[PDB]
């Protein structure tokens, strides 16, 4: 029944770490908090890898072959993964914090810099052992923490920068002339250090903004092995110089712009450097020629990387989580995205199910395309945060309500805010609701305790509905009846009739305060979440309570770091705050301040399933029992870590702010699922949480769901029937199983001209199954008009019979419709653009 798998994490493109391009250079690997996303610029795609971690990713090491990758979190745990199979190979635990990880270009060794040391390991082999990496050697040079790594293209020596403003260079294996060498000449921390294309000459960049060039007298092939000695000699019996050529300044005197990130392409001799002020510079190193410079953002530039070809440069800004890919030769952006952390609070689906509109505390409205995964239009008309958002039932119109006191409607045809509604009295709106017809727009207030209703076409205030006591928690229109249900904090849910001459109103009294209201898709049942964590299902027309669900125990909630009370005491005072019916309505999804979303069976009033949103342990309140290891005699001492986290700067933490830049507890926010929504199609659902926008989609692999099995029903008999040309029976047996590949083969085996016989012989029950499979088929199948003929025949045969039961087939038809719509539109754009144009040419030749 409820077989859904996580598919993508929209809404966030960069949190922290270093950026890396894939080996071919088409895709970019970006850390998004807990996870890793690959953006394929070649095909306009974004996919999040299924892997999850305990803490945020600090380092990403990418193998030269492209098959392997190493992902390390802040806690020190490391994960060896294959990019080809998108699956985790093996696990490891580095003892201390690792600043960076770099693979040798040959592909045999990699260096891990941690604490004051750098350890060089072999690359993982084909042999499988419980311990993944065999440590090879250790180097213990610098005074203080090591920062960066670089390797010579001959893989003979490597270089490590340090925090103690000295740069150390080591040899891959013991050279007689070069065991190690040290470099000074700087007065601040080293940010990066590189090597020439085919020499050991190096560059050192300091945080102050100084670049130093070091040149040695010995060619890299001049390195000679140490003479064997010790016990090898017993078996057998039976220095370089560096000089500072040049020193360059990236800034004018009197300006303090700290260098923060650097990247260097050897073959083109190209340097790209990003500074604390948000500007980056390009240079050609041996002459230090400034090509051009840009300003990206007010925030600093955290990480910078350049692809193999050298055309694309990647920039990340952790201040707003902004990711940018820049092509310097074309002077244009390839990709540019921005998403603030913890911003999103709202969610909606288009009626087709193709787009998702969200609003955040920042005040921005964003529309995302679920297939591509990228935002394509953003509206900034609102000044303060957006509390609610909704699509109209028919048009491509999005309506938002904000703390500005305004409810604005935007069109997607012309991309303009054509209508704005405001109250006569200055009040702040908390939610929005729009009728299915789209004529009526409604909103509720934080303080004025009254619902405002406006007309869409005219734009005047139709009415103010009063009677509630306390703020309005939520509103919802009945999809089929055009009545408005609003819940308030006076333990009441009120029903308002709009197209009624006598203004009939209903009240539904509750034991405790109400928080949310939702209608089933048909509109005959209503759900209210109350403060005692109960979900009550009512019949709106008769005002009778059909059922109730107790859900306090299921919402497993964990203690925050600063909470004096325990988990149970806090849980006794928290309830569900987000509800959403399934497409069919047989199940209900509930969520709140926890990492769990609970799916209940409404009729049985039992919990079918519990979904874990995240396992990131760098987010507050995830785990019920805090670790005893961190306790000391004076307490857990959370304020030390609080100051360390707020050392990010950018703003100044302010007392009493729960959320935002000025909030002190911003580095580790609490885990909260702000909202849930289900696709009208019924093939996926989404949730807005602190981590981002989460998409869960149907995947057949998760669960096996046969319909009517028999000992006779088997793929052997299916193919036997196929060889015997009894197509109908093979189709029926392939449909009794719910395997997509077998029914795919069974349908594709049929030659044309026998379609109508098969369609006529099909019984009524299998019609819905065939339509579902055809709808799934149009997305990923090459054979367009074959399935067009199939769909045409079944529809023209069974439309009249499907009309009577059209009520229960809504999630299917919607699905099918949009798929059949999609391809059609592009063809209608292109083919006609040929036809008439060609005819026009054929006209001109005649007049000559």
């Amino acid at each position: 029944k409820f077989a859904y798998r996580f598919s993508n994490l929209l809404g966030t493109v960069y949190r922290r770490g270093n950026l890396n391009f894939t080996c071919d250079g088409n895709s970019v690997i970006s850390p998004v908090g807990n996870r890793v996303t690959v953006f394929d610029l070649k095909n306009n795609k974004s996919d999040t890898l299924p892997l999850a971690t305990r803490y945020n990713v600090k380092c990403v090491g990418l193998s030269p072959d492209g098959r392997l990758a190493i992902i390390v979190d802040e806690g020190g745990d490391a994960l060896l993964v294959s990019l080809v199979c998108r699956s985790v190979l093996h696990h490891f635990h580095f003892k201390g914090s690792v600043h960076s990880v770099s693979f040798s270009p040959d592909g045999r060794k990699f260096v891990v810099t941690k604490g004051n040391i750098a350890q060089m390991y072999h690359a993982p082999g084909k042999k499988r052992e419980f311990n993944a990496f065999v440590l090879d050697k250790t180097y213990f040079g610098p005074y203080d923490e090591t920062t960066c790594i670089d390797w010579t293209d001959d893989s003979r020596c490597f270089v490590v920068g340090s925090k103690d403003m000295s740069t150390w260079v080591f040899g891959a294996e013991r050279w007689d002339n070069l065991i190690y060498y040290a470099l000074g000449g700087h007065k601040d921390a080293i940010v990066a250090c590189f090597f020439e294309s085919n020499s050991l000459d190096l560059y050192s960049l300091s945080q102050d903004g100084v670049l130093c060039m070091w040149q040695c007298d010995t060619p890299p092939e001049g390195l000679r092995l140490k003479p064997p000695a010790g016990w090898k000699a017993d078996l057998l019996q039976r220095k370089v110089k560096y000089s500072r050529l040049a020193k360059y300044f990236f800034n004018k005197e009197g300006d303090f712009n700290n260098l923060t990130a650097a990247a260097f392409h050897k073959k083109s001799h190209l340097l790209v450097t990003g500074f604390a002020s948000g500007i980056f510079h390009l240079h050609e190193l041996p002459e230090f020629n400034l090509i051009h410079s840009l300003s990206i953002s007010d925030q600093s530039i955290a990480s910078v990387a350049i692809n193999s070809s050298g055309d694309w440069i990647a920039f990340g800004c952790s201040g707003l989580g902004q990711l940018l890919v820049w092509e310097w030769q074309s002077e244009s952006y390839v990709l540019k995205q921005q998403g603030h952390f913890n911003s999103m609070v709202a969610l909606a689906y288009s009626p087709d199910g193709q787009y998702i509109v969200t609003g955040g505390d920042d005040g921005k409205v964003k529309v995302w395309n679920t297939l591509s995964g990228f935002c394509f239009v953003t509206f900034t008309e609102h000044s303060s945060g957006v509390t609610g958002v909704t699509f109209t039932a028919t048009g491509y119109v999005v309506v938002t309500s904000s703390m500005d006191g305004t409810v604005r409607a935007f069109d997607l045809h012309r991309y303009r805010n054509f209508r704005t509604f405001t109250s006569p009295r200055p009040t702040q709106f908390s939610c929005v609701a729009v009728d299915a017809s789209g004529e009526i727009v409604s909103a509720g207030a934080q303080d004025s305790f009254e619902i405002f209703v406006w007309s869409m076409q005219t734009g005047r205030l139709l009415d103010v509905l009063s009677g509630h006591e306390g703020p309005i928690s939520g509103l919802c229109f009945n999809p089929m009846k055009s009545v408005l249900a609003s819940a308030s904090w006076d333990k009441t849910v009120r029903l308002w009739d709009m197209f009624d001459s006598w203004r009939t109103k209903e009240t539904l009294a509750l034991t405790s305060d109400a928080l949310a209201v939702t209608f089933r898709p048909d509109g005959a049942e209503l759900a209210v979440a109350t403060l005692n964590s109960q979900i009550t299902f009512w019949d709106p027309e008769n005002a009778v309570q059909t059922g109730s669900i107790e859900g306090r125990h299921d919402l497993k909630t964990g203690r925050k770091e600063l909470d004096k009370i325990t988990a149970k005491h806090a849980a006794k005072g928290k309830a569900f705050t987000a509800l959403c019916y399934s497409a069919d309505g047989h199940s209900i999804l509930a969520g709140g301040m926890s990492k769990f979303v609970c799916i209940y069976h409404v009729r049985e009033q039992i919990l079918m399933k519990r979904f874990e949103i995240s396992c990131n342990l760098s987010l507050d309140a995830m785990e019920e029992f805090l670790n005893r290891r961190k306790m000391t005699e004076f307490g857990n001492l959370a304020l030390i870590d609080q100051d360390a986290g707020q050392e990010d700067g950018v703003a100044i933490p302010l007392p009493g702010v729960r959320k935002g830049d000025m909030s002190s507890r911003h580095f580790k926010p609490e885990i909260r699922v702000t909202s849930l929504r289900f696709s009208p199609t019924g093939r996926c659902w989404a949730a807005t949480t602190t981590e981002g926008l989460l998409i869960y989609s149907l995947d057949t692999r998760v669960l096996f769901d046969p319909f009517e099995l028999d000992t006779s029903v088997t793929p052997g008999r299916v193919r036997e029937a196929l060889r015997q040309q009894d197509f109908t029976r093979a189709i029926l047996m392939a449909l009794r199983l719910n395997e997509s590949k077998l029914v795919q083969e069974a349908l594709e085996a049929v030659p044309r001209g026998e379609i109508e016989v098969v369609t006529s012989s099909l019984p009524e029950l299998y019609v819905e199954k065939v339509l579902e499979f055809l709808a799934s088929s149009f997305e990923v199948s090459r054979h367009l008009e074959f399935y067009l003929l199939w769909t045409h025949k079944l529809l023209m045969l069974h439309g009249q019979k499907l009309k009577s039961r059209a009520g229960t087939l809504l999630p299917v038809i919607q699905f099918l419709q949009k798929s059949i719509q999609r391809h059609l539109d592009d063809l209608s754009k292109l083919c006609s653009w040929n036809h008439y144009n060609m005819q026009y040419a054929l006209a001109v030749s005649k007049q000559r």
């Binding site: 103690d164 000295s166 000074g184 000449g185 007065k187 601040d188």
Partner: protein, 153 residues
């Protein structure tokens, strides 16, 4: 009295290396440039600048009598300076690890804290600097050294 008499801008960036001369009462300040600055509350500019290292300085300590200064830096050199008008380095030694911290007793002994190991150099001290030829005592700590000081008596 409870009043701030002076607040001086060293004009050298971050300040992390500091010691005083009990005989002289002046303050020594180390910089990443390799210079040690002599300061007094009356002057708005340093009394003198002394170039001691080819890289950044990380420690400074002077004896009770005020005759000698001991400094260590990034070039892994331990130096003994003559503070009686000449300011020449009397003793020099290259070290495997780095001397993070330094101190003097009241009899003239010098201890350098390197990593998790302490080493004490002793000399006759009768109008002579400590002899850095070979250390007097050694001891290995459980963790890296973060502070050194001798008991007065």
């Amino acid at each position: 009295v409870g009043k701030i008499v002076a607040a001086l801008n060293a004009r050298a960036g971050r300040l992390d290396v500091m010691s005083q001369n009990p005989y002289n009462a002046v303050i020594h300040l180390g910089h990443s440039n390799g210079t040690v600055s002599l300061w007094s509350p009356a002057m708005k500019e340093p009394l003198a600048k002394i170039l001691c290292h080819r890289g950044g300085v990380r420690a400074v300590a002077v004896d009770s009598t005020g005759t000698y200064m001991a400094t260590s830096g990034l070039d892994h050199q331990l130096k003994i300076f003559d503070l009686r008008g000449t300011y020449q380095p009397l003793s020099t030694r290259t070290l495997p690890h780095g001397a993070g911290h330094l101190a003097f007793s009241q009899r003239g002994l010098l201890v350098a804290g390197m990593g998790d190991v302490v080493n004490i150099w002793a000399g006759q001290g009768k109008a002579s600097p400590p002899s850095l030829e070979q250390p007097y005592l050694t001891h290995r700590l459980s963790g890296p050294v973060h502070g050194l000081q001798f008991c007065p008596f």
